[PDB]
Amino acid sequence: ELLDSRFGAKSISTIAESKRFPLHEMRDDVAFQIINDELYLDGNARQNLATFCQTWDDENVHKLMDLSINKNWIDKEEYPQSAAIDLRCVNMVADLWHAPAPKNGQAVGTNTIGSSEACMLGGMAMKWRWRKRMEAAGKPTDKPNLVCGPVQICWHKFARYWDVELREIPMRPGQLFMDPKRMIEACDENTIGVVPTFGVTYTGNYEFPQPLHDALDKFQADTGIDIDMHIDAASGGFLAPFVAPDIVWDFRLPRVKSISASGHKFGLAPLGCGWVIWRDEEALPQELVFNVDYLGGQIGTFAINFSRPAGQVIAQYYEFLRLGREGYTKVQNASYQVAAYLADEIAKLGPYEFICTGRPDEGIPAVCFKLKDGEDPGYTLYDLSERLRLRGWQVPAFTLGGEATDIVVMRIMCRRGFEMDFAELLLEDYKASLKYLSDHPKLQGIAQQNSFKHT
Amino acid sequence: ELLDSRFGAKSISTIAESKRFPLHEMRDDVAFQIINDELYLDGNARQNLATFCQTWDDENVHKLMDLSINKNWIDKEEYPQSAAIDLRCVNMVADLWHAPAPKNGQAVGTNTIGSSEACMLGGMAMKWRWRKRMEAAGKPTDKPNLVCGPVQICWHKFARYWDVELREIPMRPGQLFMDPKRMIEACDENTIGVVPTFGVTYTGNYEFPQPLHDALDKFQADTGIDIDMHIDAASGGFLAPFVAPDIVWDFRLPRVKSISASGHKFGLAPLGCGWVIWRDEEALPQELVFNVDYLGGQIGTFAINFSRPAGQVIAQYYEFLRLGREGYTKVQNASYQVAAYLADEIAKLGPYEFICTGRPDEGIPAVCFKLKDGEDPGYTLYDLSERLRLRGWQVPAFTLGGEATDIVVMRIMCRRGFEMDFAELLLEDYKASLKYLSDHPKLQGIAQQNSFKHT
Amino acid sequence: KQVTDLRSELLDSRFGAKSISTIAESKRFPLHEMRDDVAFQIINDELYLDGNARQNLATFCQTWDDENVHKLMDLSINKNWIDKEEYPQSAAIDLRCVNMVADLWHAPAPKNGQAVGTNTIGSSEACMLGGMAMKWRWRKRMEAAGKPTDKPNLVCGPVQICWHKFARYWDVELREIPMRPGQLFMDPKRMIEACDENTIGVVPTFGVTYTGNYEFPQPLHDALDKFQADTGIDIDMHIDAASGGFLAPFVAPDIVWDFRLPRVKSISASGHKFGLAPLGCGWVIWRDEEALPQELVFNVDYLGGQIGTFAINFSRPAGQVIAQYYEFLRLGREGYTKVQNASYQVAAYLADEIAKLGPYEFICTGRPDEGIPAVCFKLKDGEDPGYTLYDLSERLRLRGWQVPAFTLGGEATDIVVMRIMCRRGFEMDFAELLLEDYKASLKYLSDHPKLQGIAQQNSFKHT
Amino acid sequence: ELLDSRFGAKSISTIAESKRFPLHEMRDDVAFQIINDELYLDGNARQNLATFCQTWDDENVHKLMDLSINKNWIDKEEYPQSAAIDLRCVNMVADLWHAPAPKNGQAVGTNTIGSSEACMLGGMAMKWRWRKRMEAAGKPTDKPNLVCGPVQICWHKFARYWDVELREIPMRPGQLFMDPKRMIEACDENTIGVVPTFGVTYTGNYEFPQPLHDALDKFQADTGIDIDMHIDAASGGFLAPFVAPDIVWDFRLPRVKSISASGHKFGLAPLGCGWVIWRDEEALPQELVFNVDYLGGQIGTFAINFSRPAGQVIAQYYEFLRLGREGYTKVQNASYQVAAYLADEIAKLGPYEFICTGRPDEGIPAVCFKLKDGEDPGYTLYDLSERLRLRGWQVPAFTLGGEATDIVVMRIMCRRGFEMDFAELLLEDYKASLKYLSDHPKLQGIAQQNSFKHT
Ligand SMILES: Cc1ncc(COP(=O)(O)O)c(CN)c1O
Ligand SMILES: Cc1ncc(COP(=O)(O)O)c(CN)c1O
Ligand SMILES: Cc1ncc(COP(=O)(O)O)c(CN)c1O
Ligand SMILES: Cc1ncc(COP(=O)(O)O)c(CN)c1O
Ligand SMILES: [Xe]
Ligand SMILES: [Xe]
Ligand SMILES: [Xe]
Ligand SMILES: [Xe]
């Protein structure tokens, strides 16, 4: 007769008969506690330096989210003020990225669940534009390809799910990104677009759309093939407009037909928010828009999702209102300041070569380094990653894709709430780890599992 | 210069600085109040009988959601307990639908944001299975079609986005649903699958998979053509297993390779929860599964979205645990009792012809009706709907699709929280409106806009 | 052949248990206990059918929420206003409010440091108290003069219902100066005509419920002076300043309406209107000890000696007084002036904007020197824009708004007006959105001419 | 230069600018803290045994009241559900007190802010009924009187405010309440009615209506004069129906035309809730009723107040619903158990004579006693009351009215939350005080201020 020390009663196991739908009722408050108690086993992510997504808490965001638990984004009739708020965000994000001022006062874009949806949506519209143009000219439309650099996994999914051929320019030592030369070599009249990554996941560096844009202009000159771009700005999109307004990467570039980003990365929204914006009505094929009947007349949607919570848009709106440009600038500078500082300090502690050092004009606030080629300080980065985990930190070590499959890097993400003091403390732990490693030479070479690298 | 009476300070208009990204910071607690006050203009949906989604509030769900605001469903490393709760639900749903007990102890399915993503996933798997089968028979794969009845807009989206021809059997009078005879005429060797809708959005009725299944068995006998099904049980999927276990619609049928439903409809989860289950490992082409690397190995996802909150899954788990089968039977029975009462009471109040009378063996808890042909009681259903809005209720009137385009109906949705007393009150207001329309005959015919119908 | 699995009793989807109905079982006192949390949920659930009043522009009462008012109210649920013994600190606070209000209205500085006045549940109670004391003063002056006291009358303009109640309940004849086109208010000429030696007082309404205009007490005061010079009859006033009472002192301190005028013997107003207190708070102040006849004061024994009360109510919560005190303290003259100005800004903009949308004649355009923050208008005479204000009201309800249209009293019973109340929380942005919905409705009414003339029920007009 | 230690800032005194309206703004949170701090000087009433009103806290009641802060009882249009609940309460109270089942389904009554207004209202209705009768008979209506026993102050108010001669039958030793003999001596054709008090404030005893009713029946036989009754059941009204249903005091007696009670006494509602119910339509002269226009028709009010919170009615409803008869019987008995106990136990502690010992068939849960005539234990009750204050308790010692002005009583009110355990502790403190008075004989005779005795 198994008992539970919590309830002073007969034990209900969650693991026994977690394989069948449960047969019986159980008191609501007991069910709540059992789950609540399980959840203590989840991490809080504050010491997690792998993830990009918002992990900090603001009481106001909890209140907005909690008011919004039942508020259906798709139901414009019942929730007309949430609907209004969503459209302001669309306009505000469009403005931020130099979208040509919209003819009717309303920018062409949509909120999404994350950058993943936002990319498939950008992806579909590219395909359709390329398909329309090619049928008009009487040509085969069965073999579209996409040209890009070391892209996030959403692009591999989009390519697979929509039968487009992924021409990914491989990462290679001393050329880790998509350069203009290799881009051009991979393009022809079946290329639907080119996708630069404005903040490479693996390393934190920017892929600068301008030099690529110039190559595509030249390419049109030489071949007559007119290629559009879509900027995956999952993280850059809410960084560069504030701390590096000089970098031309957005709608300021004529070939850029759409951009996407994550609200719930550096836009500071809570998990469950992305954005995609098109340059104008022509960037978005009408065949893709579905009009749904409501009382005030009908509205068009381009989204994969239908019903879903409006909480994250309202929270996004709250970030936008309370910070503005002036506010976001100070926030993102804070992060860059932390990244820079970690970068300089870590350089002093071993023979490291730095792929990314958290400068605002090169990428996102991220430190990314590898060991110097053919040097051996007595540990690998997997080893050091293991030591830091014992001190509560999740600092991922992993190998790159492509022809740089030989290279192991360590990458640190600096997000909101990882302030200068927690960086100090990481550093103390970092140093203590180097010390234990050197006191225990036997540890070398042992750890060999990659960590989660994707978001 | 303009002041605000809440703050006794210079006014900030959210409607003036609404077009561009704001330049200045504002005090957090003022942004919060500004937004909080706007959201009072949203409805609370408790008198809305137009929607399927949960709008009831339970204190434990709010707590679970609130703890879960940052829990990343995709980050199995940091949130391993959330990961575990998710997998449990997958098994529990599979079990509910009579999926073959799984070999390795883990059923084949995934959580989704809603039924929209669930259906595209199932839709994509149908396409690939059909493709693989044609390529083996050395036949062309360029003209896929999908056969179905009056489906929810997500299937129109699917067919557009993925280049499949939608053969929608049209609603017509005395013939609203996909019947076996009409289904068979639309089938051929390019049909990727047939999708019954187990709870038709427009009317509430079930399309019964079993007689369709018999027709497809006969169809393969006669032509050698072996057509699969995917059941869109958006609403029925959490009703029938409890209050009509003897309706054979699920994996008990060999042709049914996958099923989807909404957790946030009758599965009682909060907004942002959907499910899709496949019959077994072979129903899911591996080319569609993506393996992400993590510390404890690697898990395979099939999902359009990537990062996204885990609260909904956790809340769904709460509902499963606290109610079980005995609980859910009680809960759904309650809604059924309401709808059946409403249908009986309303029938006595006008010259009405009923398409759906809210019985558990016919469909979901919904009453759906139209005016009897050639009868004219001095008003239209649009008219009665507008009178009802004035007494706070949202009871939609709209026209059916296909050939029944001519037909106006009123459709009442009974969800959790809309209890017998509330139904009594609506009944009073309905009578009160009937009277006011009879006292003011000039009102007949004026209102003619369709209401939100789609979920 | 069955396929179902049903239970043979009525169930509730919330509780997965047997149904309990509030509606049958609403007829007799209930016989059985029920679980507390279930009782609570059943009730809380029903209350979602109440409006939140944010789009209700018919009411004067406070509808905005402020976290601190909620906490203060929540601490005070049990605090009994009448129980000076147990809640000496609440008693102190109440006394401070009375002084601050007196002070705000230029009451003569009290001899003993304590003004003569009381808190009440709302203006209704305030007014009966003012009316009672007026009646008693007059009764005594006549008894002194050995005259008959059985036929008292009260002169006033288009007043709120409470005066109709007071007049009935207390056997006083109501000489209401009737509203009529182009003279909607008690004017000096018609007031004088109604006045004789049984007039206990004249009651200017400083903020008319129906329209929002001020009846200005000073011209009336002048007439009443001239009237004494001619007849020797000495008539008192009492100002029903229900709403204007917490407006003019901040935005129009030059309008002479209060104790600055010697005939004004008491003033009443609502804290839970432009006072900004939460529902259930009024005030009445007497000029001095002599204005409140001792016969009306009841003395009750407490441990610290005895205190005198002039209240209709006895036991009652102190929350609103404390809440009112919070408002006074946190705002001051400086804060009120701002908060009040904000509301007048909304009214002025609505009035200037709405004027452009149809053929309207304006009774009140929300100007600080004319009345309260209210917009009140009627259709111009003999214009037919294609709808009545009743119809326009209806289309507005469908968009969530409650903007009343109702007929005026007296001889103007032939006029339909629309009135918009602008209170705290109804800010410029919300006024922008009303304007959009108003425009949308006009467009709907113009594309759908059959709607004209159909709607004809009066909306709630009184507070 | 003066500082506050709480805010480490320039001091604000509430005592300075308690004289004039304040000039300046302060920070909201500071204002709030200042006030909150002063409130700590208020008692919490748990040891106050002088009062009648509810002083116990229940979480649900707090939430309801807090939901209802803006809910306007008069505004039937905006808060239709609060209106509906109000009306149910009228019906439940009517039934409770054996009112004749109302014709049209709605009993004639109204909620009020307390017993005081409810008494005013019943009083006016009495004065009108007599007025109308007398006019019809062509007789003087200028000299109305009221006959009553030791009434609560509201009846003295009633009489002054409405020009009715109060004929209060005075208390006298051995005869403390209105008895039929003296009642009849005071009655005539100008008597608007007799008011028995069903739970006398000063003592706790019931004035029994039935023997008076017989006296009034006999009276009408001898003289032709027909005299109505109003019961003041401020406290008795929510006691006898549960623990003494046999006492015939209510609408079972035909001459009872109206009854009034406090919700916030033994009705268990929070402060600000009273009831008055009429026997039927005819009991309530239509002159007194005012019709206000709303949209759903028009409603009749008979109230002194106009705008006011609906929180308390709602709270009252919750108490009714959750408890019922069976609950109320339990709650009320428990209080009687306490007062019975105190009465037996105090009896043993000195030379006391009891006026009221907390028996259900005699009065409310109160103990009221005086020192035995010509007996001197060496203290007065005033002295005992003061000793008890020192140890936290408020136990009032006062003198009775009329011809018992020679008499000092102590009176203990036993209300909800003053449970057996607290009585026990009062007894301990009671014994210690007597011991202190015994050891310190000088203390005797010194204290002489009457306590608050009225509610
Ligand atoms: C470049 C890029 N694009 C897409 C994504 C996916 O974003 P989300 O998880 O917000 O859907 C990420 C995060 N990995 C990314 O770095
Ligand atoms: C049959 C069906 N399938 C798909 C959906 C879409 O579900 P969701 O809102 O969860 O995306 C609905 C609800 N409209 C539906 O009725
Ligand atoms: C002039 C006037 N008098 C008194 C009142 C009554 O006040 P209350 O609702 O606060 O009791 C009102 C509106 N009710 C009013 O506007
Ligand atoms: C018998 C009697 N009648 C009337 C009242 C007045 O009650 P309230 O304070 O609820 O107005 C009381 C309160 N002492 C009472 O006991
Ligand atoms: Xe869009
Ligand atoms: Xe999967
Ligand atoms: Xe007073
Ligand atoms: Xe009433």
Compute the nearest-CA separation of B221 from chain A (Å): 33
Using a CB-CB cut-off of 8 Å, the residues of chain D touching C35 are 322
What's CA C93's distance to the chain center, in Å? Answer: 23
Residues A241 and A358 in one domain: no
A302 lines ligand 5 (CB under 6 A): yes
Count of Cβ atoms closer than 10 Å to residue C260 Cβ? 14
Residue B438 structure tokens: 């009879």
CATH of the domain at B176: 3.40.640.10
Count of Cβ atoms closer than 10 Å to residue C411 Cβ? 12
Alpha-carbon distances of D166 from B362, C136, C296, D147, D204, rounded to whole Å: 73, 18, 15, 7, 22
Residues B31 and B75 in one domain: no
Whether A110 contacts A301, CB under 8 Å: yes
B116 known ligand binder? yes
Which amino acid is it at A407?
I
Domain span at A256:
55-348
Whether A388 contacts A395, CB under 8 Å: yes
Compute the nearest-CA separation of D55 from chain C (Å): 6
**Chain B interface, mutation test: which of A78, A127, A157, A302, most B Cβ atoms within 10 Å?**
A78
Q: How far apart are CA B70 and CA A272, in angstroms?
A: 10
Using a CB-CB cut-off of 8 Å, the residues of chain D touching C409 are none
∠ CA C21-D308-B390, nearest 5°, is: 55
CB contact under 8 A, B243 and C4: yes
Q: What is the C-alpha R_g of chain D?
A: 24
Residue C9 structure tokens: 């009793």
Strands C298-302 and C116-120: unpaired
Please give the full DSSP string across A171-238, using - where no structure is assigned.
Answer: PBTTB-S--HHHHHHT--TTEEEEE-BBS-TTT-BB--HHHHHHHHHHHHHHH-----EEEE-TTGGG
Beta carbons within 8 Å of D130's beta carbon, 6+ residues apart: D141, D144, D190, D191, D192, D193, D228
Of B64, B398, B449, the CB nearest to A35: B64
Domain boundary, last residue among A320, A348, A376: A348
Encode C12-37: b = buried (16+ Cβ within 10 Å), e = exposed: bbbbbeebbebeebbbebbeebeebe
> Tokens 């009073």 correspond to what residue?
B428
A154 lines ligand 1 (CB under 6 A): yes
B141 known ligand binder? no
Residues D119 and D192 in one domain: yes
Alpha-carbon distances of C307 from C100, C290, C298, D302, D452, rounded to whole Å: 20, 18, 8, 30, 11
Residues D453 and D344 in one domain: no
Q: How far apart are CA B32 and CA A319, in angstroms?
A: 10
Q: How far apart are CA B339 and CA B356, in angstroms?
A: 10
Across the B:C interface, residue pairs with CB atoms under 8 Å apart total: 138
Three-state SS annotation for A93-145:
HHHHCCCCCCCCCCCCEEEECCHHHHHHHHHHHHHHHHHHHHHHCCCCCCCCE
Long-range contact set of residues D10-13: C-beta below 8 Å, sequence gap at least 24: none
Count of Cβ atoms closer than 10 Å to residue B435 Cβ? 11
Q: How far apart are CA C160 and CA C162, in angstroms?
A: 5
**Chain C interface, mutation test: which of D19, D68, D306, most C Cβ atoms within 10 Å?**
D306
Which amino acid is it at B343?
A
- Using what technique was this structure determined? X-ray
Residues C363 and C345 in one domain: no
> Tokens 């428990």 correspond to what residue?
D334
**Chain B interface, mutation test: which of C18, C21, C427, C436, most B Cβ atoms within 10 Å?**
C427
Domain boundary, last residue among C16, C40, C62: C62
CB contact under 8 A, B334 and C2: no
∠ CA B131-B136-B142, nearest 5°, is: 35
Q: How far apart are CA B345 and CA B338, in angstroms?
A: 11
**For residue D33, which of C317, C316, C78, C67 has the smallest C-alpha distance?**
C67
> Tokens 């308690």 correspond to what residue?
D18
Please give the full DSSP string across A22-82, using - where no structure is assigned.
Answer: --S---HHHHHHHHHHHGGGS--STTB-S--S-----HHHHHHHHHTTT-BTT-TTT-HHH
Q: How far apart are CA D81 and CA A254, in angstroms?
A: 59
DSSP for residue C332: H
Beta carbons within 8 Å of A395's beta carbon, 6+ residues apart: A49, A50, A384, A385, A388, A389, A410, A412, A426
Using a CB-CB cut-off of 8 Å, the residues of chain C touching B241 are none
Residues A181 and A290 in one domain: yes
Residues A336 and A452 in one domain: no
Residue D235 structure tokens: 């406290």
∠ CA B223-B228-B234, nearest 5°, is: 145
Residues A24 and A149 in one domain: no
User: Separation of A294 CA from ligand 5 center, angstroms?
Assistant: 16
Q: Tabulate helix, strand, coil % of chain D (nearest 5).
A: 40, 15, 45
CB contact under 8 A, D32 and C462: no
CATH of the domain at D428: 3.90.1150.160
Whether B78 contacts A42, CB under 8 Å: yes
Residues A13 and A160 in one domain: no
Domain boundary, last residue among B324, B348, B372: B348
CATH of the domain at D3: 4.10.280.50
Residues D243 and D103 in one domain: yes
Number of domains in chain D: 3
Cα pseudo-dihedral C66, C70, C76, C78, rounded to 10: 150
Beta carbons within 8 Å of D282's beta carbon, 6+ residues apart: none
Alpha helices, H only, C298-427: 319-354, 389-398
User: Separation of C86 CA from ligand 7 center, angstroms?
Assistant: 20
Three-class DSSP category at A349: coil
Residues B116 and B232 in one domain: yes
DSSP for residue B288: G
Instruction: Give the relative orientation of helices D311-347 and C36-46 as an angle to the nearest 10 degrees.
Output: 150
Three-state SS annotation for D106-122:
CCCEEEECCHHHHHHHH
Q: How far apart are CA C175 and CA C156, in angstroms?
A: 7
Q: How far apart are CA A103 and CA A106, in angstroms?
A: 7
Structure resolution, Å: 2.8
Whether C326 contacts C275, CB under 8 Å: no
Beta carbons within 8 Å of B318's beta carbon, 6+ residues apart: A31, A32, A35, B60, B61, B64
**For residue C329, which of A56, D34, B221, A234 has the smallest C-alpha distance?**
D34
Strands A145-148 and A191-195: parallel
CB contact under 8 A, B443 and C425: no
> Chains C, B in contact: 3+ Cβ pairs under 8 A?
yes
Side-chain-facing half-sphere of C70: CA atoms under 13 Å: 11
What's CA A178's distance to the chain center, in Å? Answer: 18
Whether A416 contacts B70, CB under 8 Å: no
Q: How far apart are CA D88 and CA C25, in angstroms?
A: 9
Which amino acid is it at B451?
S
Residues D315 and D421 in one domain: no
Alpha-carbon distances of A139 from A126, A287, B141, B179, rounded to whole Å: 17, 20, 19, 41
| Helices and strands in chain C, H and E counts | 11, 15
CB contact under 8 A, C342 and B5: yes
Report the nearest atom of ligand 4 relative to the CA of D262. 10
Beta carbons within 8 Å of C253's beta carbon, 6+ residues apart: none
Task: Identify the residues whose C-beta falls under 6 Å from ligand 4.
Answer: C 314-315; D 52, 114-116, 119, 152, 154, 197, 199, 201, 232, 234-235, 262, 274, 454-455
Q: Is the Cα dihedral B423, B425, B430, B435 positive or negative?
A: positive
Three-class DSSP category at C450: helix
Please give the full DSSP string across B313-330, using - where no structure is assigned.
Answer: HHHHHHHHHHHHHHHHHH
**For residue A271, which of D343, C19, B313, C183 has the smallest C-alpha distance?**
B313
User: Separation of A161 CA from ligand 6 center, angstroms?
Assistant: 15
Q: Is the Cα dihedral D178, D183, D186, D192 positive or negative?
A: positive
Strands A145-148 and A165-168: parallel
> Chains C, D in contact: 3+ Cβ pairs under 8 A?
yes
CB contact under 8 A, B2 and C397: no
CB contact under 8 A, C103 and D454: no
Three-class DSSP category at C349: helix
Whether D366 contacts D414, CB under 8 Å: yes
Cα pseudo-dihedral A47, A48, A52, A57, rounded to 10: -40
